[PDB]
Amino acid sequence: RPTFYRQELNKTIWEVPERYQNLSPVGSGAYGSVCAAFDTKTGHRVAVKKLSRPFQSIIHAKRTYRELRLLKHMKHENVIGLLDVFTPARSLEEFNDVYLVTHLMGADLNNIVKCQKLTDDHVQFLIYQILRGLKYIHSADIIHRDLKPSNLAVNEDCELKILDFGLARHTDDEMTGYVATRWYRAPEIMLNWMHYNQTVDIWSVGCIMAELLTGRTLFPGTDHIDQLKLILRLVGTPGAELLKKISSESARNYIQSLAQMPKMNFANVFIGANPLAVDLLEKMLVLDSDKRITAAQALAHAYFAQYHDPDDEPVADPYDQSFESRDLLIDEWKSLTYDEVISFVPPP
Ligand SMILES: CC(=O)c1cccc(NC(=O)C(F)(F)F)c1
Ligand SMILES: [Cl-]
Ligand SMILES: [Cl-]
Ligand SMILES: [Cl-]
Ligand SMILES: [Cl-]
Ligand SMILES: [Cl-]
Ligand SMILES: [Mg+2]
Numbered sequence: 509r510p511t512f513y514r515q516e517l518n519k520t521i522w523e524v525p526e527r528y529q530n531l532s533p534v535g536s537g538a539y540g541s542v543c544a545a546f547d548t549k550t551g552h553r554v555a556v557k558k559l560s561r562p563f564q565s566i567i568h569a570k571r572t573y574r575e576l577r578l579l580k581h582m583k584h585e586n587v588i589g590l591l592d593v594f595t596p597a598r599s600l601e602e603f604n605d606v607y608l609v610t611h612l613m614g615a616d617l618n619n620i621v622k623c624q625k626l627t628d629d630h631v632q633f634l635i636y637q638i639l640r641g642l643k644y645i646h647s648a649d650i651i652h653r654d655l656k657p658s659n660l661a662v663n664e665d666c667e668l669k670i671l672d673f674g675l676a677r678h679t680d681d682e683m684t685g686y687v688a689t690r691w692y693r694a695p696e697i698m699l700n701w702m703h704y705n706q707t708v709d710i711w712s713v714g715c716i717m718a719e720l721l722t723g724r725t726l727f728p729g730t731d732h733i734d735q736l737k738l739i740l741r742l743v744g745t746p747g748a749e750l751l752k753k754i755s756s757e758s759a760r761n762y763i764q765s766l767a768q769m770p771k772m773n774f775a776n777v778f779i780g781a782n783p784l785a786v787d788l789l790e791k792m793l794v795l796d797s798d799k800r801i802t803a804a805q806a807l808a809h810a811y812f813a814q815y816h817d818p819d820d821e822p823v824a825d826p827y828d829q830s831f832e833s834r835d836l837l838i839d840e841w842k843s844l845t846y847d848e849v850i851s852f853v854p855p856p
Pocket of ligand 1: 650746750754756759763796797798
């Protein structure tokens, strides 16, 4: 067991191993507080997250276990990984606090799309890396659920990592009105007309790629209905074959009130774009989620010819998510989490 030391930073006690020095506050959502630190064992600048109220309810205890399981699994160049996890507790009986350690990220994709002149080569490389990471995530039967520019870290060498997996955390208030939290979400889930499946992540990639080509949000709706009307104007209203698959009475009832509209000409929307970029956008931004391109198919599209290497696009080890259907008490979720903290092995 390492030696721990204590300090108070913005009204919070931080108890951490001596290896972590120069702690300075960076941020605090409702899920926890974050400090930047220098890790003297590895020489990395790191983010240290202290979870808030991790075992306050069954819902919260299960979310803690979910997050730790996911971060322990993810071992890929284009996905955030776990550098360390610790607790100051010396036994399960005194266990209350969980701290998560990752590489410190600087710029996100929001920063670079607002500010920098992107060539077609920059768009090819950034979207390639998102799809390489998504091939690996989807091979584990994990859905990200929250891909958007603020969840994509990018360094000065245009190298990209996916972070901030959806832990089923977003509220109705957070999705209301003129908000980036909704602009990247697939229609069939905006009002929960379809059960979630991995195809919703490819919709989000299409929205992100469009915004790197134009510098503008693709579907900046003022509310869920405004956003659906912007989507259907571009991709067309549902056809007969994609009404036959829509089981939700709520969906067919609103959908069938709208005047029918054809799919627009994407070369006239994305004026001047690489024709191969236009073609790939037409294959992602399809209303019928069964007919969307997959991450593995998209890596083999001609748009990525300069970067595609089918011997360097790895898949994940199998991921057991059977806990998601299991009914346990708070202390049972807490013991499972404790076990996962003590069994952690750091990366090479
Ligand atoms: C199976 C499938 O692709 C599916 C299932 C339910 C709803 C929708 N989409 C829509 O209802 C909307 F796009 F018009 F919003 C699509
Ligand atoms: Cl230490
Ligand atoms: Cl990482
Ligand atoms: Cl503790
Ligand atoms: Cl964003
Ligand atoms: Cl597993
Ligand atoms: Mg985020």
